[PDB]
């Protein structure tokens, strides 16, 4: 399992009044590239006429 | 809430940094057989809309 989350970022605290505690609104995007190799067996030889 | 809530505070836009050094080159260097004269001007090239 690959777990992903955005690291939460704190909003401002300090001299500004009434701020409370907040988080920055952030989202993440990206490209998931998945490569899978499969082993392949050969086809069985066919004796049939038809 | 507002940054104006602190009366001695200003908003900040978090601009970029560019630690380049450049010269303002000006002056005449005289020698026995020559002078090298340098001047610098700021120039502006306007927006041309068409």
UniProtKB/TrEMBL annotation, chain B:
Coiled-coil annotated residue ranges, if any: none
Leader sequence residues: none
Domain of life: Viruses
Compartments, record wording: Virion
Transmembrane feature ranges: none
Similarity section: Belongs to the parvoviridae capsid protein family.
Protein name in UniProt: Capsid protein 2
Gene name as annotated: VP2
């Amino acid at each position: 399992q690959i777990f992903l989350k955005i690291l939460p970022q704190s909003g401002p605290i300090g001299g500004i009044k009434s701020m409370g505690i907040t988080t920055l609104v952030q989202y993440a995007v990206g490209i998931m590239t998945v490569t899978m190799t499969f082993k392949l067996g050969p086809r069985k030889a066919t004796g049939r006429w038809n | 809430t507002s940054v104006n809530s602190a009366e001695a505070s200003t908003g900040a836009g978090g601009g970029g940094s560019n630690p380049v050094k450049s010269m303002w080159s000006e002056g005449a260097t005289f020698s026995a057989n020559s002078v090298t004269c340098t001047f610098s001007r700021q120039f502006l090239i306007p927006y041309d809309p068409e």
